[PDB]
């Protein structure tokens, strides 16, 4: 109301002084003394005031810009989009606000199943057939059902009701509906029933998983044939001993377009084609759930570290590329480990598709508590009782009894004794459904076997192979390692992230949708560290980038199947570069421009991984792995970090297209989902072909880094596992500076997701001893008959057998506990075995004391590291991080000039030869 609002903004403390300034100096001195026991802090209003001038412009200027591609290109294997990243005068652009808005259509292929179970008749039994017809030696047999109860039956069909006096009969296209039957529980008489039965030309499927498309508006499915009229014939049935004749059951025969779009047959009884009686025993099993989606943080779209497909950021005057990418850099993993350190990695950010690959901890490490099934769980009939007998009311005489038929009827359904019931163990069935769906179906393929009478694919990287390999439920049944927190030895070397409980890929698949055909709209971040946080000064810059079209790289399936064979395809419609400018004032952004063009104000960046990446191949079942770095100035060396990979699961980057890479699961090289850490025995590091590192009698075994042991005579293991005491000391000092003043649980901010202690899980179980137990008999999976007559044999099919005392496993408890031996191991996922190049294995700075040592800085030393690993029957890799200082310094001296100097030490990418 007042032209100068300041005298009453200062009075009410809207704009003015802090409470340290407007209060009396004795009250401020009082409130600081009593602050811990009598708070006067919130009793006084403290104003905060935004700056008016020289912060935000008043001119017409956009926050977000839209950059059309100047020069786009669609290869059959990649996509290239070239832009003009024009930063105008008195404007600054942080390249973190820049991203690519990619549109297109994603085809997930026929092998995508985003849900466990089936969509159609899931409550049906798996052996329950449809109402089907067949031929025997030829007569056409009918096995059907007539649930509807009408009024009368003539040759026109069943009478569903009247319209006045005219009998209005059932419309044969959709009536009688297969969902409508009796509503009462007691089996009253139906003299005029009807139902629907599939014809003999319709192929016989089980009810579980059966779908036919509806061919009219009223939902009545049936093949329309041109003459466009449905052929639904009526089939009248009567009593066997009745053959006047009145028909009792009318079955509307029909041809449907029947299909099982999300199930498969787990038991084919007959190899022959055509309908038969034996095909009522075929049993349907749901297909394995396959989550096909873009990777976490959009790994695999963008060509990083492929210098043949290297992107461009250069000014349009010079067009000299300021991006100098390298093949022994890992820009994807440097961005996966960066987001763990500066943020909560458990959270989900849908815009960058930031949903971390995370297995379920019950599935990886089986913590088998048994089942809480002390009470029997019974099912009961519809009216509580079915086997009542007929009795007659009897009144006493005036010993003596006589019939009372005046008030009570002579027929009374009265049950004598307990009612009928059947018993099911519910908690065991929920736990046996858990272990089979999550663990037994994810076993290695050497454990499984081919189904009988089912055509299976020959390519093992096809989903049709992985779906149909039938696995015995007795391998992982509800009694495996009872009371042992023990991951299976079969399941250690199997990727836990290729699973349908991978909650990241579970989230990233549903973020696109549930269908095969997904038109997507994605925002892909920039990960190259020199241009990831770069603040561009004004100028005209070209900004060119290569995108992948490889469906084994841009997509992630939860089984790891070859998505090129499995019909997955991606098509890019258009890509737009967006860039959000801060609306800075044109004199402030001219001062900031002029300050940041000095050669002392150069923006310098560092890759978060900061490592040289060397994949050393390991042959199949090869225990010893010798590597060799020939000769180098080892100045500014930080340390090592290593993890075994798989050659099947790791693509050779630098190649723009690998036609022999038949895998679309989690790539541990790119996302940080490392899981083969436990397969290391020892590391022997010897500098200069003579000097063992660290030397100095540092370790209890001073010549090498013993990571784990089988033979432990001298007693050097930690954590009730087989990890040694030297190696647990190093790994707690490398990550946490913990170990010289006692081992303790590190703080929650140092113990991130990809760290050691978050993921180190020690385990122990007891198995039977074949050397001490006297009555030991090796019983294979063919002859183990626990749950003998209540469980299907070697199959998820129907039960078979008799009730009988089990023979497997041997009891480890009780008075008859067998002679048992302890097997110890550990699993430590998601992490890299860090060995820091420090004289006390501690992090006292990023540039360590041995990297500054005059031994390694003024001389050239050889390096001969000798890894010893567990044998694996698969060609595996070895991913050693040679930790360096991958540092860029960026100079922009004039408008549109972008000069960068890259340098990493020791493993530099430029010497006098280049």
């Amino acid at each position: 109301a007042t032209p100068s609002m300041m005298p009453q903004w200062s009075y009410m403390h809207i704009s003015g002084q802090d409470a340290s300034e407007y209060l009396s100096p004795g009250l401020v001195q009082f409130a600081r003394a009593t602050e811990t026991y009598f708070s006067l802090n919130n009793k006084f209003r403290n104003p905060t005031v935004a700056p008016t001038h020289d912060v935000t412009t008043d001119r017409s200027q956009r926050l977000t810009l839209r950059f059309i591609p100047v020069d786009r290109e669609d290869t059959a294997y990649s996509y290239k989009a070239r832009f003009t990243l024009a930063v105008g005068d008195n404007r600054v652009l942080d390249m973190a606000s820049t991203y690519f808005d990619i549109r297109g259509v994603l085809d997930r292929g026929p092998t995508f199943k985003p849900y466990s179970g089936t969509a159609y008749n899931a409550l049906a039994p798996k052996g329950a057939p449809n109402p089907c017809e067949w031929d025997e030696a030829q007569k056409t047999h009918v096995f059907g059902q007539a649930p509807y109860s009408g009024i009368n039956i003539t040759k026109e069909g069943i009478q569903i009701g009247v319209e006045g006096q005219t009998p209005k009969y059932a419309d044969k296209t959709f009536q009688p509906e297969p969902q409508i039957g009796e509503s009462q529980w007691y089996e009253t008489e139906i003299n005029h029933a009807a139902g629907r039965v599939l014809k003999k030309t319709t192929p016989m499927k089980p009810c579980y998983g059966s779908y036919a498309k509806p061919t009219n508006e009223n939902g009545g499915q049936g093949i329309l044939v041109k003459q466009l009229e449905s052929q639904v014939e009526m089939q009248f049935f009567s009593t066997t001993e009745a053959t006047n004749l009145t028909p009792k059951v009318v079955l509307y025969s029909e041809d449907v377009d029947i299909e099982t779009p999300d199930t498969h047959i787990s038991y084919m009884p007959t190899i022959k084609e055509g309908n038969s009686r034996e095909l009522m025993g075929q049993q349907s099993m749901p297909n394995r759930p396959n989550y096909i989606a873009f990777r976490d943080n959009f790994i695999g779209l963008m060509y990083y570290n492929s210098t043949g497909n290297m992107g461009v950021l250069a000014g349009q005057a010079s067009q000299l590329n300021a991006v100098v990418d390298l093949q022994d850099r890992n820009t994807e993993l440097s961005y996966q480990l960066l987001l763990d350190s500066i943020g909560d990695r458990t959270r989900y950010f849908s815009m960058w598709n930031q949903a971390v690959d995370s297995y379920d901890p019950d599935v990886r490490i089986i913590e088998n508590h048994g089942t809480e099934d002390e009470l029997p769980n019974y099912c009961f009939p519809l009216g509580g009782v079915i086997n009542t007998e007929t009795l007659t009311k009897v009144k006493p005489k005036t010993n003596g009894w006589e019939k009372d038929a005046t008030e009570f009827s002579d027929k009374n359904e009265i049950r004598v004794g307990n009612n009928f019931a059947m018993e099911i163990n519910l908690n065991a069935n929920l736990w046996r459904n858990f272990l089979y769906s999550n663990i037994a179906l994810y076993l290695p393929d050497k454990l499984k076997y081919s189904p009988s009478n089912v055509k299976i694919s020959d390519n093992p990287n096809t989903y049709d192979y992985m779906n149909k390999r039938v696995v015995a439920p007795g391998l992982v049944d509800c009694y495996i390692n009872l009371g042992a927190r023990w991951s299976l030895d079969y399941m250690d070397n199997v990727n836990p992230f290729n699973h349908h409980r991978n909650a990241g890929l579970r989230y990233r698949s549903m973020l696109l949708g549930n269908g095969r055909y997904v038109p997507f709209h994605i925002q892909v971040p920039q990960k190259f560290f020199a241009i990831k946080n770069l603040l561009l000064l004004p100028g005209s810059y070209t900004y060119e980038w290569n995108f992948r079209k490889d469906v084994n790289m841009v997509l992630q399936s939860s089984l790891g199947n070859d998505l090129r064979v499995d019909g997955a395809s991606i098509k890019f419609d258009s890509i737009c570069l967006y860039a959000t400018f801060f609306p800075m004032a044109h004199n402030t952004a001219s001062t900031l421009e002029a300050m940041l063009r000095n050669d002392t104000n150069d923006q310098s960046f560092n890759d978060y991984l900061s490592a040289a990446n060397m994949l050393y191949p390991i042959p199949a079942n090869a225990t010893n792995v010798p590597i060799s770095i020939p000769s180098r100035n080892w100045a500014a060396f930080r340390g090592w970090a290593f993890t075994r990979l798989k050659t099947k699961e790791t693509p050779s980057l630098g190649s723009g297209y690998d036609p022999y890479y038949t895998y679309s699961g989690s790539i541990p090289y790119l996302d940080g989902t490392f899981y083969l850490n436990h397969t290391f025995k020892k590391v022997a590091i010897t500098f200069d072909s003579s000097v063992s590192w660290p030397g100095n009698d540092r370790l209890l075994t001073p010549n090498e880094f013993e990571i784990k042991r089988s033979v432990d005579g001298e007693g050097y293991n930690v954590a009730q596992c087989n990890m040694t005491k030297d190696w647990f000391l190093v790994q707690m000092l490398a990550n946490y500076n913990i170990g010289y003043q006692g081992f303790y649980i590190p703080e929650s901010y140092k113990d991130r997701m990809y760290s050691f202690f978050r993921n180190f899980q020690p385990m122990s179980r007891q198995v039977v001893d074949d050397t001490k137990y006297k009555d030991y008999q090796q019983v294979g999976i063919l002859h183990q008959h626990n749950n003998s007559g209540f469980v299907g044999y070697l199959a998820p099919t129907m039960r078979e057998g008799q009730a009988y005392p089990a023979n497997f496993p041997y009891p480890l408890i009780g008075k008859t506990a067998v002679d048992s031996i302890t097997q110890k191991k550990f699993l430590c996922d998601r992490t890299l075995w860090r060995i820091p190049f420090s004289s006390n294995f501690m992090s006292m700075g990023a540039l360590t004391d041995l990297g500054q040592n005059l031994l390694y800085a003024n001389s050239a030393h050889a390096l001969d590291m000798t890894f010893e690993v567990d044998p694996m029957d698969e060609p595996t890799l070895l991913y050693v991080l040679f930790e360096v200082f991958d540092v860029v310094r960026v100079h922009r001296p004039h408008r549109g000039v972008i000069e960068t100097v890259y340098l990493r030490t020791p493993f530099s990418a430029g010497n006098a030869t280049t």
């Binding site: 811990t36 026991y37 009598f38 708070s39 802090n41 919130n42 500066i342």
Partner: protein
């Protein structure tokens, strides 16, 4: 990202932002680091 620091050069860790017992909730008063 970095704990608070005084500059007496030498570089001295500052004790501000640490947790204390307070009769009133500490988020409405201070920033707790």
């Amino acid at each position: 990202p970095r704990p608070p620091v005084e500059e007496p050069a030498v570089e001295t860790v500052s004790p501000e932002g640490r947790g204390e017992k307070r009769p009133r909730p500490d988020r409405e008063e201070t920033l707790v680091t």
